[PDB]
Amino acid sequence: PLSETKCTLKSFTVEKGIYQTSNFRVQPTESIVRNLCPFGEVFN
Amino acid sequence: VDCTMYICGDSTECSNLLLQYGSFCTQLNRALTGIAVEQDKNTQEVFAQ
């Protein structure tokens, strides 16, 4: 996370202060998907 | 405001195209940061003299 900010300033000298590096996101673990056909009425 | 996420919701299909408009994504952050940085300079000079 330190090396990605130096690419934002394009400089090898990084002045004292706070710099905003690229954002982060939390990523998804899994997908959640949320009648009946009468095969008991056809086959039986 | 994150241009990449705002314009293109979490999807690279749109993220790729955004690369073709170049700095439009970044320079906005530079503009907004340019605002938000001095927003504390305002409160700085007004209240703390």
Yes or no, beta carbons of A25 and B5 under 8 Å apart: yes
Residue B16, CB-side half-sphere exposure with 13 Å CA sphere: 2
Q: Mention every residue, 6+ apart, whose C-beta is less than 8 A from residue B18.
A: B3, B4, B7, B8, B24, B25
Dist CA B37 CA B40 (whole Å): 6
CB pairs under 8 A between A and B: 7
Which of B:6-45 have CB within 8 Å of A?
Answer: 10, 29, 33
Structure method: cryo-EM
Q: Mention every residue, 6+ apart, whose C-beta is less than 8 A from residue B17.
A: B8
Quickly count: other Cβ atoms within 10 Å of residue B15's Cβ: 15
Dist CA A10 CA B47 (whole Å): 35
Dist CA B24 CA B17 (whole Å): 12
Q: Mention every residue, 6+ apart, whose C-beta is less than 8 A from residue B32.
A: B1
Would you mind telling me the total number of residues written for chain B in this entry? 49
Contacts of A27 in chain B (CB under 8 A): none
Resolution value in angstroms: 3.5
